[PDB]
Write a protein that binds this ligand. Structure first.
Ligand SMILES: [Fe+3]
Ligand SMILES: [Fe+3]
Ligand SMILES: [Fe+3]
Ligand SMILES: [Fe+3]
Lengths: 123, 123, 123, 123
């Protein structure tokens, strides 16, 4: 198996048995359209999910596929959360110059890597 | 010199020459009082400051001194920002059980480590 | 595109034009066979590749697919390197209980995410 | 209290009661003298110390005070370890241009931040 194959895509996440008990797939909130170079908020959150030393969303990575860039993706940010203190809920502020796709990857110490994605238009 | 001594405290930050050109000391926004186990937002931001490959706030660490805990501090979260895409501005969601002090530490690739602190009461 | 698809697999890495100029695919050095619970070294390195503020291997993530684990992978470690000071070369010390596959993912600020993988037998 | 004051210095570490049970102060192995721009290894390790989900050295940060640099320190690298899989033992490869002081900061989820320091001469 390739590393990429191991990641739970949002289409496959829906049919997982664990998903009946808890949610790992990130929710990405962001404007569908933004102006170039103008700051906007992106909120990423995972839940409901346990948040304890033995089981929690340890971190979230935010990436961006920039349309037309010769190589992709760009990592935009990464946030790590202390189990039992910080909820897996973060807001970033970004500025973009070109349209593309935002990817949020969450990591659970028990349940692996889960992906969310969201198109964003820059005009 | 100890490592701790190298960090720019908010009282010393005020008199630094670089501070006339740009701000490194984090701003922490958080309720003065919260209820135990109830989620609340903490916003940490640094600015105005350059945000480019050659010079940016690379990351922010959020720590907590918990009054009465036998050892301190607890790291609550850490966020890294891609230069030129992500602004050094983050919102966390926390739950606390005991009163203490929030510390935000920012890192600039040119200008080092800068500290902000803020008391928080849990009742 | 899924996030997983974006990652440069070691089979695809070979035919990339950029690979004629520089190497992004991690080299993983690790024993083929180890004893359960006994510490061993894993060395991960990327090169030759530029190492400057404007272009460097920013970090490496080490993951493990554990055969028989209900969910995968487990993140084993992550290391970030200061451009121009630290070379993208790290040695970890691990203990494993079960056989599986080590994955090393490198990130270049210009050229994206590149994967290496290596089987490890635990007896 | 300032954030810097909270960090356990190597002189204070010696007299801590917890230090009779386990070691948090990093050991830094590095040449006393190196040539400018020539790669060398720095090994940082913490132990003996528990390594489990509930209690482990979560990460190590490596910093450098560069003599003559207008601001300090520079972060050289940071490594995070999965509890129960990775031992808190890392080797970095560095290149330096100027003399200074290496600082290693370890973090324990129960016992806080502990400092080690080591002079390095560049000739
Ligand atoms: Fe989970
Ligand atoms: Fe600065
Ligand atoms: Fe590259
Ligand atoms: Fe400890």
């Amino acid at each position: 198996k390739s590393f990429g194959e191991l990641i739970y895509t949002p289409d496959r996440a829906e049919g997982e048995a664990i998903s009946k008990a808890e949610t790992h797939t990130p929710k990405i909130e962001a404007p569908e359209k933004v102006k170039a170079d103008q700051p906007f908020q992106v909120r990423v959150s995972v839940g409901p999910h346990p948040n304890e030393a033995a089981h929690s969303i340890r971190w979230i990575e935010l990436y961006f596929y920039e349309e037309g860039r010769p190589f992709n993706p760009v990592m935009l940010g990464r946030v790590a959360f202390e189990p039992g203190y910080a909820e897996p809920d973060v807001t970033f502020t970004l500025k973009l110059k070109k349209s593309g796709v935002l990817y949020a990857i969450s990591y659970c110490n028990l349940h692996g890597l889960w992906e969310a994605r969201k198109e964003i238009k820059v005009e």
